[PDB]
């Protein structure tokens, strides 16, 4: 048979257990084999969570690896160069991004999002910041969101 398994691993730091472990060893494949080559395709990606799909055949021995796109909270912390975000969101800053920065993230995740417009991908991303103690353009993001709608920025687009 062929079974596909996705787990999110720390990029470069992938180990033989668990998260990857309970997810493959039932596929009758050797464990490190699908570990070396992960830390290969996620070298650049050091320290961050990233989705990894392992397409295994259980029959005749073989696997393959598809490195996916990191979650949004991840992409945010390495435009900030941080590892752990706020303990009390909206009670502390951590935590600042410029609107062009968020845009760059939005195009990366827009294709997995529901939003069919850039401006909506961005409003999404801003929402995630509201959960983390990050601010954009030096203000609460709930506000930047209002402004994109109010037609304040608008030049950063089209």
């Amino acid at each position: 048979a062929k079974e596909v398994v996705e787990v999110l691993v720390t990029g470069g730091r992938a180990t033989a257990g668990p998260p990857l472990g309970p997810a493959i060893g039932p596929l009758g494949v050797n464990v490190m084999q699908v570990v070396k080559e992960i830390n290969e395709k996620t070298k650049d990606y050091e320290g961050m969570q990233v989705p990894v799909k392992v397409i295994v055949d259980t029959e005749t021995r073989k696997f393959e690896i598809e490195v996916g796109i990191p979650p949004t909270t991840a992409l945010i912390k390495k435009e900030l160069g941080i590892e752990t975000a706020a303990h009390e969101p909206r009670h502390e800053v951590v935590g600042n991004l410029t609107l062009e920065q968020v845009i760059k993230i939005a195009k990366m995740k827009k294709d997995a999002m529901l939003s069919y417009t850039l401006k909506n991908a961005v409003k999404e991303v801003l929402g995630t910041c509201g959960s983390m103690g990050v601010t954009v353009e030096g203000k609460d993001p709930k506000e930047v969101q209002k402004e994109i709608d109010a037609g304040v920025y608008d030049e950063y687009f089209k």
Partner: peptide, 17 residues
């Protein structure tokens, strides 16, 4: 610190049984 089929960070979990 131990079990079979039971955690997320260290090393135990689940399986046959």
């Amino acid at each position: 610190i131990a079990s079979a089929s039971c955690t997320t960070x260290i090393c135990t979990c689940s399986c046959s049984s």
